[PDB]
Amino acid sequence: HYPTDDIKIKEVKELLPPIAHLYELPISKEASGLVHRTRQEISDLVHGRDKRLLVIIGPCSIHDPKAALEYAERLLKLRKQYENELLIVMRVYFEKPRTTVGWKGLINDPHLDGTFDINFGLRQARSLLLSLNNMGMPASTEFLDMITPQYYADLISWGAIGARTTESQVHRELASGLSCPVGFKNGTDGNLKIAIDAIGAASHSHHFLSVTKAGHSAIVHTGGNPDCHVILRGGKEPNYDAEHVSEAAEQLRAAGVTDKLMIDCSHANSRKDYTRQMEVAQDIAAQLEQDGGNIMGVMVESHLVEGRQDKPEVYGKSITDACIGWGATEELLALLAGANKKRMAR
Amino acid sequence: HYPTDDIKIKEVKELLPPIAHLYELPISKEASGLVHRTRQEISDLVHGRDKRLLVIIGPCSIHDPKAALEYAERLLKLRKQYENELLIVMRVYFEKPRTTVGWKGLINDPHLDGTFDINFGLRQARSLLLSLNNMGMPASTEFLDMITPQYYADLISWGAIGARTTESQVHRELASGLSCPVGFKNGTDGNLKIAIDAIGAASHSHHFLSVTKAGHSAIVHTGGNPDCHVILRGGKEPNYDAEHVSEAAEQLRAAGVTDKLMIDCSHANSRKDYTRQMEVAQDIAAQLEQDGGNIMGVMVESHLVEGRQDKPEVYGKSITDACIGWGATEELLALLAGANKKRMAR
Amino acid sequence: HYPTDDIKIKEVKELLPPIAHLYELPISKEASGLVHRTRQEISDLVHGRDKRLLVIIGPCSIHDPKAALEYAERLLKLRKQYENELLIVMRVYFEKPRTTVGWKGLINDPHLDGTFDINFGLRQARSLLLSLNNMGMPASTEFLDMITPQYYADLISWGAIGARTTESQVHRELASGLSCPVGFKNGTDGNLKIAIDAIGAASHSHHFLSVTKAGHSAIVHTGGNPDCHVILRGGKEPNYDAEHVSEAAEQLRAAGVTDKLMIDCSHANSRKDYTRQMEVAQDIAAQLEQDGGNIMGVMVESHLVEGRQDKPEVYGKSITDACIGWGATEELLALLAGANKKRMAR
Amino acid sequence: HYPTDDIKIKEVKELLPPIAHLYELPISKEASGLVHRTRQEISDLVHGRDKRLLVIIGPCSIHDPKAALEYAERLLKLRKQYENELLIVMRVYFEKPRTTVGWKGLINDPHLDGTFDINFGLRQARSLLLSLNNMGMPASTEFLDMITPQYYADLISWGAIGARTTESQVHRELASGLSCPVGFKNGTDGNLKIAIDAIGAASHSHHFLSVTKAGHSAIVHTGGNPDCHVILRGGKEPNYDAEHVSEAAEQLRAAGVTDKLMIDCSHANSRKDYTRQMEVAQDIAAQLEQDGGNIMGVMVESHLVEGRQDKPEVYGKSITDACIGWGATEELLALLAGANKKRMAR
Numbered sequence A, B, C, D: 001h002y003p004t005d006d007i008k009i010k011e012v013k014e015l016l017p018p019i020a021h022l023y024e025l026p027i028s029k030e031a032s033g034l035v036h037r038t039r040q041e042i043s044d045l046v047h048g049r050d051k052r053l054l055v056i057i058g059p060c061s062i063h064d065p066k067a068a069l070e071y072a073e074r075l076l077k078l079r080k081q082y083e084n085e086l087l088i089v090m091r092v093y094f095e096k097p098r099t100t101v102g103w104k105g106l107i108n109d110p111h112l113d114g115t116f117d118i119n120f121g122l123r124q125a126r127s128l129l130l131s132l133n134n135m136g137m138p139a140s141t142e143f144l145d146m147i148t149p150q151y152y153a154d155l156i157s158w159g160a161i162g163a164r165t166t167e168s169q170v171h172r173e174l175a176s177g178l179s180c181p182v183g184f185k186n187g188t189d190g191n192l193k194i195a196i197d198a199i200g201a202a203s204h205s206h207h208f209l210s211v212t213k214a215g216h217s218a219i220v221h222t223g224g225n226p227d228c229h230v231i232l233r234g235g236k237e238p239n240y241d242a243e244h245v246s247e248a249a250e251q252l253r254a255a256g257v258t259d260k261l262m263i264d265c266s267h268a269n270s271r272k273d274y275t276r277q278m279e280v281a282q283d284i285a286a287q288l289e290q291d292g293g294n295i296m297g298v299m300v301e302s303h304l305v306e307g308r309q310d311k312p313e314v315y316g317k318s319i320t321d322a323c324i325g326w327g328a329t330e331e332l333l334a335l336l337a338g339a340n341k342k343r344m345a346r
């Protein structure tokens, strides 16, 4: 026969199934309680029942777990300190999607050297998330595929579907069966309709393909996710100001979905310049003081150290998108806490 | 000890692995030969080694195998008759992605009644593709997820990644290991950079998660797909005309990827009107007559009977997007054949 | 770094999982009814609620399914005719365990030429069992390992654990979770304790290692099989006469298990002389006339044609142990039917 | 559709696949060398190329790994002390086969409380075996089924098939693909032919059903095991003396298999009284000092503290068959080393 199968495949390696990771790193009672509780709390924010600000804040991507747990220990103090004004949740993204050839994230390539030790990667990803939850810091992440969630979704209190996948039917179907609340980002060029469309789609029951905990191909029948919302992350032009929030909210009401939204201070809203995250946060603060009824959260890309680097030389310094440092982070959260205390008190 | 896992999952059900369907419906010598040959012949059009026009043509979605087989028998005659000018490959899409609630396609819901007998669907799909190839008709389809291809990619001569997934990293990774040439559509609002980037991305080696033929979770390390191209399919504005082809070509050369492209006569370029497909085809024909050096194919939604219908009452009429009928198909193909006969003789 | 794993293994090949066979050959409504009620009917014989005689009768091993179906259609007329006196179930054994190099049975080597096409054999075995049941003929078999049952046990009305495996803990555990009544044979040298112990063991809950329907290693927690009994099949000397029955009954009563047993007319009771099966059946008929309260069934090795052959040249003639032909079978059943008519009438 | 499938199954639970354990506890360089060499050294005894006595000695069953490690540390000193005369390998059996309801072993029930935590049991079993090998004590075990060996056979230098399974075709097939040398015991009533038949059978190639390292059902094709021998373990009467050895040797040569055998000092050769293990060993000693040409090994049930316990209330005390203590073990080994010194020196 002429060959027709796997013509462009170098290798297919079997993967340790989720149950193997679950046996080594079973979720503890206290992590279980933190996740259940934070999921519910976030849901209240999504549907306008509590007026705290959800703050998803942390590195662009995790490239070292030691630095991440160190970051978490500082953030934990602010989480407790601002607990009446803000619901702080740590951003634990293992990979930034990239068009150009480059590092594929911590799950994919934990040794940062192109050896793609994914079993170790997933094991590390789960270990980190259990430790964070065990210390009192809830975690959030981006789900890029339909398989990785079986390894650690049980430890995630909030999920994101990125700008590049919000329109994708299979990612919407995934979101409809995710145990956590989910935010959908507007398209890379500013299209908001696709995120509005996605919350619609994700609240309904769907079927997609994936694997069981034991690692076998299966059909997943989901119940719908009622806790979805939009994230404004800019486009050609930023979309974070009051007028864009207003238009967005009107559109969400017309589609019959939640008009409470998140604003990303990073990415195309900061123009890929980390020193502008603070500008976006200040405008949001202004919005919260005047009115700001439709804002329920913000996203901030933050690290121990500011900026970015191509190689992982410097500890707690991003190797993907540039972040603000810890000093600026304390400044940003004091401000948001300050502004939302006034909103909550009106 | 609060629950955190599969909170919004109604059911998970095991799927028959690929090997079960490969065991019952193994590829034949003839089907292997046709797939292999057709994939090569198409790559030749992609890289400009041959100036025949690839015509991806057939129903919007397959909802009846008998009608598809009948359609194929008619198309076969014209595939042979035009074989020196056109490379005709049947469209065999099992689903049409959509945002609203509705029929999820032949793989997901073969009984067209909401039972989701996916084991049956996947079986019928492979059976139809094996039959089409055995009769002399090569097939093409859209790959919407990372698992379904293990079940029938071996029977597919050309693959599409739709507008909604072209920017998705995991779909680009998938394309990088598909055995067939792959077309990337421009975004739903007419964005071409995502498809140009996708070609660049898919030519490189990647890892993604999927399942082995035996249905177990796995790491797939791909080789890169050197045979990818863009498909112009409209957006806010149609992009089929000479001026758009030339803008696209310029952008492709500047990214250092192939400047040969496909034009979808349907969907947003026809504005969802099936009678405008013939208009787009004539415009393409006129370009091939004048120059048209960057056009390597077209896409046409065609069935035995023209139009569309909500319920599958009429034999051979679409229940998804509207199609041209057999009569206009004959004329479209005869038009494109003659226009390309001239381009070829230059 | 020395190799320590799989030193003496030539190949490990993956099987189609049971779900693959179950999907091609699902159990029909009618086959389900037959299996359900025959298991119940037999259970009534084991615990003494009904005085009909279970007759397990058919070839030593199946090597041709067509002969087995032709055998089955003749036997069916007799199953119907003697249904008030005899409960006739066909023997569908796929393999005779042996010590010397030879044919490994219809599952292991369905093509009978040493190519070990196990996927094909499991398929053929299931199809044969399905067709038998669909025609009205219940089936029985011997379970030699802990994995093959997942492929066809749903089609089996009565099971044997052979003389060579009755003492094996893992086989006793299997029996404890088999859906059918099970007969255990006495040891090759005549030891009855191992079968009495086996019945005891198998009535309890156990755990044993096996495979799920999807083919994954699993732990099976069984509930106990309350329907087990012994089979007197001879030893150094035959054990079929009234004295031996009576000694067995007492021992059975002493271990507090059912004192109804089965007598195998073949094997070491006939001493591998198929013409003696008739004399064993005549002894049993006499016991039934006189009393025989502890007999609930008999086993008989029977085919279309008598004797045995080394190669499968002659149609419907055994390639394992020698069987009685069809004419002698008619006599034997008539003999047993008439005798038990009088036992039942008392 | 009446139910016919799994009627008497309480629960099917997925088991961690072997690879999961092999990932947490990979074999080390040193353990590899110890396993590889010992297997070769045993092969040499089996085939008469060295006259050292193989000594399989250790607890009847392991129920505490701390005690097993302490026992091993003491045994190691003797292993080295007597290395020129004896090859001391540790008995590391996890379960003892039972007809009556009892503790089902360390693998099945590591917590000694009916929780059947088999994943943990298998993990513990592997861990113990890896530790033993790491400190320089090779290990030996009974293989009771066709799945457990995938989890630790790589750490085993000698395997036993017990009296209850020696006649079993599937265990013979298992043995034919085991990396270690294998001993087959004579039947529980003293039948030697089954063990002689077993060696014959196990030296040829076989197919049996099992699971891959990845935990999926598979067809195993073995190469044959050339290193099998019998074990004399008594029956209705003891079989350990010169005249039973002589007669066994004769039947062995006559069947064209190795006439070197092992004698079990325990079980039916001791009358199930641990105090008579020594009297058996004294007889073997006398045989060696006169001739003892056919003896290549002995088997001894020994522990730190002598005797049995109904429940595990004491350190280093058997909870299954009764074992001689350390004192009696020092004396037995001295006796054997001394007698065998004399055999080796002529």
Ligand SMILES: N[C@@H](Cc1ccc(O)cc1)C(=O)O
Pocket (backbone or CB within 6 Å): A146, A147, A149, A150, A153, A154, A177, A178, A179, A180, A209, A210, A211, A212, A220, B004, B005, B006, B007, B009
């Ligand atoms: N386990 C995920 C949902 C999920 C289920 C099955 C899958 O295959 C994938 C994802 C959660 O609890 O959110």
Ligand SMILES: N[C@@H](Cc1ccc(O)cc1)C(=O)O
Pocket (backbone or CB within 6 Å): A004, A005, A006, A007, A008, A009, B146, B147, B149, B150, B153, B154, B177, B178, B179, B180, B209, B210, B211, B212, B220
């Ligand atoms: N088998 C596909 C490539 C592929 C391989 C593995 C997967 O999991 C998915 C897709 C092809 O030949 O095109």
Ligand SMILES: N[C@@H](Cc1ccc(O)cc1)C(=O)O
Pocket (backbone or CB within 6 Å): C146, C147, C149, C150, C153, C154, C177, C178, C179, C180, C209, C210, C211, C212, C220, D004, D005, D006, D007, D009
């Ligand atoms: N399926 C078997 C019982 C069984 C279940 C699991 C196994 O792994 C083996 C046997 C029956 O219906 O009798």
Ligand SMILES: N[C@@H](Cc1ccc(O)cc1)C(=O)O
Pocket (backbone or CB within 6 Å): C004, C005, C006, C007, C009, D146, D147, D149, D150, D153, D154, D177, D178, D179, D180, D209, D210, D211, D212, D220
């Ligand atoms: N792994 C075993 C042999 C074996 C192989 C496969 C199995 O499924 C079972 C046992 C050994 O090395 O001795």
Ligand SMILES: [Mn+2]
Pocket (backbone or CB within 6 Å): A060, A096, A266, A301, A320, A321
């Ligand atoms: Mn980022």
Ligand SMILES: [Mn+2]
Pocket (backbone or CB within 6 Å): B060, B061, B096, B267, B301, B320, B321
């Ligand atoms: Mn369409």
Ligand SMILES: [Mn+2]
Pocket (backbone or CB within 6 Å): C060, C061, C096, C301, C320, C321
């Ligand atoms: Mn027989």
Ligand SMILES: [Mn+2]
Pocket (backbone or CB within 6 Å): D060, D061, D096, D301, D320, D321
């Ligand atoms: Mn013992």
